[PDB]
Ligand code: HEM
């Protein structure tokens with residue numbers, strides 16, 4: 001199954017370290033986050049929110065970039081990757097109205113998204129889920145996990161991405177920092 | 182709502198004229214197709230199958246191409262457009278593993294999908310729905326409607342599309358011809 005759900009509440013495999021309401025309406029603070037593979041129609045009792053997304057095909061990356069990423073990208077669930085960050089993101093309607101070449105030019109030519117992110121591998125593992133087409137309040141659920149030694153590097157990366165032209169189209173953003181239980 | 186459901190059965194707004202099983206497993210013959218805006222977890226009692234897809238953002242079309250289509254494409258629900266064709270399509274795993282630049286090269290550079298399709302406007306209205314990310318047996322639900330006087334032109338377009346490099350990656354196709362009731 002390509003669907004994944006993220007349940008904010010009192011149970012889960014991940015302990016919430018903090019929630020930073022970066023931009024727009026935030027997410028209610030909770031004790032844990034439970035990650036399930038599949039959809040969850042029955043939102044658990046004693047649970048504050050539910051985020052769901054699906055893995056999908058590549059949308060912007062080209063062959064040379066995929067080869068670069070595939071050459072260094074770390075696997076998920078490394079023994080040492082005990083910190084994780086779940087960053088739901090929403091982009092503006094103006095972004096989704098643009099043609100494919102316009103969005104690619106902003107994504108890479110202007111923001112150099114992949115080139116910048118490649119500088120922080122193999123320290124950080126990542127997973128990208130889509131959820132706009134599901135009608136969710138967010139468009140993407142991004143997931144990053146890494147060892148504590150790279151926490152400062154991840155914060156650096158966040159600052160660099162948040163100054164890019166691409167992020168001028170971001171309308172809602174939240175950071176949920178997690179600790180592997 | 183961006184989700185659309187197509188129920189094959191004994192009720193609906195469209196009458197099935199014929200079902201041609203072009204490639205792979207087919208669709209059971211039914212009297213009518215019922216189109217519903219929204220998801221449908223409960224397939225009606227007197228129905229054979231259920232297809233669902235969602236409208237999504239542009240994945241390949243360039244700005245200049247979108248401008249060319251927007252200048253000639255007709256709207257849906259024209260009084261004259263009493264014929265419709267619903268063509269579910271599945272593409273091979275080899276297609277989905279390719280990078281964005283590779284898939285775009287096959288779609289337009291080699292197959293000229295959009296240049297070829299533009300030659301049959303404004304006769305043919307169209308709607309593209311995505312369903313692979315929903316876990317459906319098909320990847321796309323394509324919809325076309327037109328006046329009977331264009332039926333020969335549409336068939337010609339089918340033969341042209343099926344001879345393209347893009348269609349070498351198609352591994353399941355069905356044509357459901359419909360008449361507005
Ligand atoms: C850490 C290293 C990173 C790498 C290697 C990386 C790489 C990529 C690549 C190659 C894509 C394109 C996927 C596709 O073609 O479909 C992508 C998409 C995306 N990334 Fe990252 N990225 C990184 C960090 C981040 C961070 C820190 C964030 C958010 C804070 C982020 C948010 C996104 C979003 C929202 C998308 C979807 C873009 C869209 O479809 O509009 N990425 N990333």
Ligand code: HEM
Nearest residue numbers: 238239240241242268270295298299301305309321323342
């Ligand atoms: C009749 C005139 C047609 C026009 C103007 C046209 C135009 C287009 C355009 C511009 C796209 C790109 C959508 C995007 O960028 O997201 C597209 C996608 C697609 N079209 Fe057509 N098309 C036509 C006919 C057809 C026919 C007859 C079929 C099937 C028999 C078809 C099947 C598809 C499929 C499966 C896709 C999605 C491909 C993918 O995303 O991998 N089209 N069409």
Ligand SMILES: O=N[O-]
Nearest residue numbers: 126127128142143
């Ligand atoms: O690729 N950003 O999760």
Ligand SMILES: O=N[O-]
Nearest residue numbers: 307308309323324
């Ligand atoms: O061109 N898909 O309706």
